Amino acid sequence: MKPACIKALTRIFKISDQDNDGTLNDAELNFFQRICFNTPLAPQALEDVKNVVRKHISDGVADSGLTLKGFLFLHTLFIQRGRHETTWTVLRRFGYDDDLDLTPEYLFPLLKIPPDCTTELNHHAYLFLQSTFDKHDLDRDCALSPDELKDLFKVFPYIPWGPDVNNTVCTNERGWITYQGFLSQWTLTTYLDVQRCLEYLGYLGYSILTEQESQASAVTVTRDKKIDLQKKQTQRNVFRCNVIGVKNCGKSGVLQALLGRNLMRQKKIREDHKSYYAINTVYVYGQEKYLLLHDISESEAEIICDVVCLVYDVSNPKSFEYCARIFKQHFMDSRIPCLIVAAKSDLHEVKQEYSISPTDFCRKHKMPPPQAFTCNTADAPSKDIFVKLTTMAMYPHV
C-alpha cells in the first residue's frame, strides 16, 4: 500500500522490538496490544493470529515471534477492510498524525526552563538510555560500531550525530563510542540543547515505551544558580567549564585529555571532525559528577559557566598575558571560580612577558596556584585538573 504508511509501521515495529532480535515475542506483543488496545489477547487467541499469518506467508512468524513482514501482513490482512480504525489506532498511539508524520506535541513537548537553571536526565531517563545501548550493542563490545549506530538511527528521520561526537565523548581504541561515552553524549545534549534531546527521545519512543505523558518526563530542571550560591550548596550533577586561552596554547589538548587521549592520539584526529566540546565523568570526594568542557576560541553567552579554566602555554612568553587580560575583563569581580593551568608542562618553561608572574597573579587575586598540566604522556594524561575544576564548580565558596 502507501509507502508512507509502510515506513511508519516499519518504525513502529522497530520501537516495539525492544530486544532488537527482529521479532516481537509474546512479551513484546502483549505490551503493544496493551498500550494500543487496552488489553492483550488470550494466549490461545494469539497463536490463532500467528496461524493465520503462517497460512498466508512463511516469513511472518519466526521463533514463534511476529516478524516485520508478518506485522505488515496483519495490517494488510487488516487493509482489505472497512477495518481501518485499527491501523490508525496504532499509528496515532505512536505519535503520528493523519498525514503519517510525528506530531509537534509528541516531538517537541513544552518544557520551560527558568533563567540560570540547567537541564539534566533523571535516574529513569538514564536507565532507558542504558537499555537503548544494550539493545543495539549486538556484539557486546560495550561500544557502538558504525553499523550499530546506523541501526540505532533507523528510527530517526535524519542522522542525529556527526563524526565530531566521537571526539567529544569517550571512545574505544578504534574510535567507537563507548557505553559511558554514549551516556555522556546524551548528558551533553540534555544540558546544551534540551529541546533537541526531547526530540531524539521521541524518535526512540521514550514516552511510549516508558508510558509517560511526554518526553519532558525524562528531564530534571535544576534550581536557580542564584539559590545554589546563596545556600552555598548544589544538587547538580552536570557542571560546565569554559576553557579560555590564546590560539595554539593547548586548549584542544585539555579537552581531549578529559576523554583520556594523550597528545599523539590527538594527532590522529581529522580537522573536519574536530569538536569544541568534551564531557566525561569525574569523581570528587567520592561523588560522581559530569564535567562539561567548552573550548572557547580566541575571538554574556560564552562566559556563563560554573568554573573558568584559564589556560596558558609555558613555552609561550606571550600566552599568560591573555589569561590575565580576560580575568580582569570578565571574572575579576565574579563569583565564578577561576583556575590557571600551565599547559604543555612537558616542554621547557619560558619566562612570561607579563608584568607579574603567573604564581603571584594567582595569590593576589586569591586563586589557587597555577596548575601544571600536560597531555603529552606515555599513557593517559592526568585527570587532576578536571577533578579540581569540578571540585571548584561544586564548592565555589571555598
Ligand X SMILES: Nc1nc2c(ncn2[C@@H]2O[C@H](COP(=O)(O)OP(=O)(O)O)[C@@H](O)[C@H]2O)c(=O)[nH]1
Residues that bind ligand X (CB under 6 A): 245, 247-253, 263, 343-344, 346-347, 374-376
383 marked ligand binding residue: no
- From 26-34, 50-58, 203-211, 239-247, give the range in contact with Cl ion by CB under 5 A: 239-247
116 marked ligand binding residue: no
Instruction: Supply the minimum distance, in Å, between the C-beta of residue 238 and Cl ion.
Output: 25
Cβ proximity to ligand X: between 310 and 343 the closer is 343
Report d(CA 310, CA 95) in Å as an integer.
47
What is the three-class DSSP state of 389? helix
148 marked ligand binding residue: yes
Cβ proximity to Cl ion: between 116 and 321 the closer is 321
What distances in angstroms separate CA 222 from CA 194, 237, 391, one per listed residue?
A: 13, 9, 18
250 marked ligand binding residue: yes
Q: Which of residues 266-325 bind Cl ion (CB under 5 A)?
A: 297-298
151 marked ligand binding residue: no
Q: What count of other Cβ atoms lies within 10 Å of the Cβ of residue 216?
A: 21
Report d(CA 341, CA 256) in Å as an integer.
15
Instruction: Supply the minimum distance, in Å, between the C-beta of residue 247 and Cl ion.
Output: 4
What is the three-class DSSP state of 339? strand
**DSSP string of 69-99, one letter each residue:** HHHHHHHHHTTSSS-THHHHHHHHHTTB-TT
Under rule CB under 5 A, residue 247 binds Cl ion:
yes
Q: C-alpha grid cell for residue 162?
A: 556527526
Instruction: Supply the minimum distance, in Å, between the C-beta of residue 257 and ligand X.
Output: 8
23 marked ligand binding residue: yes
Cβ proximity to ligand X: between 264 and 356 the closer is 264
- From 41-49, 241-249, 338-346, 365-373, give the range in contact with Cl ion by CB under 5 A: 241-249
Which of Cl ion, ligand X, Mg ion, none does 376 bind, CB closer than 5 to 8 A by kind?
ligand X
Which strand (E) or helix (H) includes residue 393?
A: helix 384-394
Do 158 and 200 contact (CB within 8 A), yes or no?
no
Sequence-ordered strand ranges (E) for the chain? 23-24, 66-67, 119-121, 143-144, 177-178, 219-221, 238-244, 277-284, 287-296, 307-313, 338-343, 371-372
Q: Which residues face 121 on adjacent strands?
A: 219
Which of ligand X, Mg ion, Cl ion, none does 249 bind, CB closer than 5 to 8 A by kind?
ligand X
Handedness of CA 270, 262, 292, 197 (dihedral sign): positive
55 marked ligand binding residue: no
Which strand (E) or helix (H) includes residue 360?
A: helix 358-364
Task: Kindly list the residues in this chain that would bind Mg ion in the complex (CB under 5 A).
Answer: 17, 19, 21, 23, 28, 137, 139, 141, 143, 145, 148
Which of Cl ion, Mg ion, ligand X, none does 137 bind, CB closer than 5 to 8 A by kind?
Mg ion
- From 195-203, 244-252, 346-354, 388-396, give the range in contact with Cl ion by CB under 5 A: 244-252
* Residue 372 backbone dihedrals phi, psi, to 5 degrees: -65, 130
211 marked ligand binding residue: no
Cβ proximity to Mg ion: between 137 and 313 the closer is 137
Nearest alpha carbon to residue 289 among 257, 359, 241, 338: 241
Cβ proximity to Cl ion: between 235 and 297 the closer is 297
Q: What count of other Cβ atoms lies within 10 Å of the Cβ of residue 318?
A: 14
Instruction: Supply the minimum distance, in Å, between the C-beta of residue 291 and ligand X.
Output: 17
* Residue 385 backbone dihedrals phi, psi, to 5 degrees: -65, -30
Instruction: Supply the minimum distance, in Å, between the C-beta of residue 25 and Mg ion.
Output: 5
Residues 6+ apart with CB under 8 A from 57: 69, 70, 73
17 marked ligand binding residue: yes
- Annotated binding-site ranges for GDP: 248-253, 267, 274, 297-298, 344, 346, 374-376
- Annotated binding-site ranges for Ca(2+): 17, 19, 21, 23, 28, 137, 139, 141, 143, 148
The contact set with Cl ion (CB under 5 A) reads: 247, 297-298
- Annotated binding-site ranges for Mg(2+): 248
